Amino acid sequence: MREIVHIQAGQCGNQIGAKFWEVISDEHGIDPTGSYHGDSDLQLERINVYYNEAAGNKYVPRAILVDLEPGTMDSVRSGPFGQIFRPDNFVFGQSGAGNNWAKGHYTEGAELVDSVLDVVRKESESCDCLQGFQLTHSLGGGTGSGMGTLLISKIREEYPDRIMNTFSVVPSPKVSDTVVEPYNATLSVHQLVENTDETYCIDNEALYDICFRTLKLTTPTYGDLNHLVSATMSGVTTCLRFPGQLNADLRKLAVNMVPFPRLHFFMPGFAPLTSRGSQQYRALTVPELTQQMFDAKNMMAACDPRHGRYLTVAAVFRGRMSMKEVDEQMLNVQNKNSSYFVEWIPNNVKTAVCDIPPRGLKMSATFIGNSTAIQELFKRISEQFTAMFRRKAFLHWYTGEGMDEMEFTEAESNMNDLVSEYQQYQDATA
């Protein structure tokens, strides 16, 4: 249970995974060549969770690269710390669908998924104590979402005894490369709501809004959002990358945070607010960080957390603070806003503390929770799909292959049932 297999999907997934690797390597004291050079023994204590011992004393990420457009792998190689990745992990299609799920699912998806199954087996049966897989994937583009769905489905059916995890880049209406987003999102969720067991949705329009207003990034590009989402995801996986009794492995995380088979959708939260290059941030008191988790703009999903009741709560703080003050603050906020939780789930607020703070920071706050606030993403995609399908707009693009809309009806019915489950769990009394 000492190792995790990383998987990438789509371009945006590729750069978010690369940024994840470089930030965690920076905080784990790993040089570009893969040899440890830090001082704290905690980084090397369980580096096997996201790294593998290599030739000499080198440490190599246990990731894999999956896409179809040839430019994604080249961009990954261009970025810093690209070379430290496994050289043979680059699995890319020779044509590239380009946000066109219909062509990339069958014409290029078959051999690609066979090859990725071959490699995942290559480092699975060779692996010692494999536990599960986690993914950084996108949903706005049909191609990357298609690969993500294919890989998760095959690795779930091949490994039913292994924990399933994935991170989703939820499409946003502010920026839309293609308008086929509703179809891809519906098929992806129809696959994952039972295929996956962990889902930290990252909503793009929330990132754009926080960059524009809170972070003053008037022009949020790919890297601008990628820096902050990588910081947040390093914060959330700090539970795993370093020793801690709370959330020892992915399976413990799943059993503690998933109350129902379809309740595996999470609100990401991180504090304090930070950007790329801004060093003007100073030391902040703990109570500010504690109250910061009630802020919508400090979340990574454009929801209304006040409306929902947190079924489960996960939080970690990084730094050297007197954490008795921390759980005093958590008790105070729980007493203040118990109306924002569910009384029938005893003590869903599980929190631990991490000694090492993230890069360019001395105290940090990370928030993870499960509530009905995620249901507004499903409501948004439902109304978008209804608007796009009432006139059957762009349906002929999908039907060019020849499939019917029966599976579309199944997907929409299943997600409406999911929304109903969320609403009934919110309305449930004690």
């Binding site: 249970m1 000492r2 104590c129 536990q131 005894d161 009794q245 709370l246 959330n247 020892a248 492995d249 399976r251 413990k252 799943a254 059993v255 503690n256 998933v258 109350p259 129902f260 088979p261 079924l311 489960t312 007197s322 954490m323 008795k324 759980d327 009384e343 029938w344 789930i345 005893p346 003590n347 869903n348 599980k350 769990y425 449930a428 004690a430």
Partner: protein, 430 residues
Amino acid sequence: MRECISIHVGQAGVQIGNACWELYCLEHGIQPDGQMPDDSFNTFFSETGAGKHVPRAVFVDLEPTVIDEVRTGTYRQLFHPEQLITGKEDAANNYARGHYTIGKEIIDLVLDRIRKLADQCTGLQGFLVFHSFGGGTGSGFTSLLMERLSVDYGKKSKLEFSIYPAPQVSTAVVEPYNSILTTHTTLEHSDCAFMVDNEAIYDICRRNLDIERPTYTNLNRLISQIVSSITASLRFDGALNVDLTEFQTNLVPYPRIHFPLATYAPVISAEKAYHEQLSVAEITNACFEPANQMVKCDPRHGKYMACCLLYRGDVVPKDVNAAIATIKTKRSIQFVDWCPTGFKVGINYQPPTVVPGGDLAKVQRAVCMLSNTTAIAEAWARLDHKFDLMYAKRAFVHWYVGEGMEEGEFSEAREDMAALEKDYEEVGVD
């Protein structure tokens, strides 16, 4: 000849086992190599022809991490590697995985080592085992192991040192489910069991120990002190002695009610050792103090059965009788007509011992009073409230359903624990 066997499961359970074995070897003055600088040590330690002494116990867990640090700790020349068994998969706070999905795949080898170490247990009296209710491994594998040995031998004793989890230290919200499953599946087999409510030890460390914030090391050290005080009668000989069989006779009148609520006193910090220690009467009064037990119960609403005491220090029988007479005048003691007798006396002259460098200071008198009453039903009521508030909505059940289990076992365990608690209150009813 009077051999005894101990078992350790779960990270918390095996850690407490390590701590208690450390305090045991300090009690006998056993160096980490096993050098010998009462004869009851042979009941827990096995001596070879070369003079090396190894405890007649075993540390097992589905994860190796704690066993790894044990095998890299400070007792390399003490424990043989074959009584330190590590699994590959993890129960992950799940009774189902720890019992059936992963438990049965290793318990056969576990029984292989148990049988080989029992091959030289001629005078075997019974088995000891440490587990926490919250611990998924310490729940499922504990229940499986207990029922397996009940099948193997039966009348051979199997006494429990359980750890009752607390919300401040709790890691998994599913923990009351595990507690209910353990108590239902072990009630027919646990001849006697001791709980350790971590809220009690938490407040003891906060106030009595004068510690700003309780740590796992300190609370586990004090728990090991309590365990050693309980097991001293087995590990030492005095004028008044109590053994496992007569532990069962004098502590378990009702087969279903096999939860004797013990207590220990006194505790004082190193910095406060400069003050005169409490006398026999003072410590005896401090015994029944509401915040001076291993659980956060309400002794003011209890129906006592019979007193059992464990003096291990400089207590003369005259002081024992004086303390008993003074306690007999207490206004918070209510007895039962079916057990007119209400006192049992055990005195040990061996001075108490504590871990060097710990928070607790050296004392010359100590008391481990043994009690059983309806006051223990408050923790039962708390876990009942948790289980009813969760299982009504069937929260977290799907994780158990995915391991070849149904809701019927949950329901029947619920009514079994309801029958237990109604038995408690009915015995409490005049």
